[PDB]
Amino acid sequence: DWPYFIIDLYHWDKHTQKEKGKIALQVNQSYGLLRDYFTGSELAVTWANEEFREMFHGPLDRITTYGGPTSEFLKENGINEVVLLDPWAEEVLSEKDFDVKAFIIGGIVDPKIGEELESAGIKVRRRKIVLRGDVVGVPDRINRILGIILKMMVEGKSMDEAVYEMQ
């Protein structure tokens, strides 16, 4: 019943080797968070390729990995709508989004991920995280974004509270 939290590697080849290594770090940290709240398998990595997998020190059976497009992963799991965390979104993430079955928490680079998903028939809810209506103090790292969502979704905390706690 719990949603997937997706790290989308669509833009993998546009990153430096250091940025690739930071993504692997964020995957490990995000698994740690979801292993506490849930089981850990709710973390899903799409466009997972061999270079990404070789940045780890063991198999990734504990998380959901998927070599193909995010839209295909969603369709395989009967999901037709996702929340895309995007600081340029018009609407702020809220409790009315927590019935959606998948949240894309990483992958945006600035061919937009949201445009490609919509062209493949996936409804995309673009939602931003703010603090007092501003971005000051709002973390932009994947695992911290995830921590904010989980505090709101699991613990029922307001966004201001969740952002403050995750600073």
Swiss-Prot record:
Residues 1-167 form the SAM-dependent MTase TRM10-type domain. It comes from the Archaea. Belongs to the class IV-like SAM-binding methyltransferase superfamily. TRM10 family. Disulfide bonds: none annotated. This is tRNA (guanine(9)-/adenine(9)-N1)-methyltransferase. Catalyzes the S-adenosyl-L-methionine-dependent formation of either N(1)-methyladenine or N(1)-methylguanine at position 9 (m1A9 or m1G9) in tRNA. The lineage of its organism: Archaea, Methanobacteriati, Methanobacteriota, Thermococci, Thermococcales. It is found in: Cytoplasm. It comes from Thermococcus kodakarensis (strain ATCC BAA-918 / JCM 12380 / KOD1) (Pyrococcus kodakaraensis (strain KOD1)).
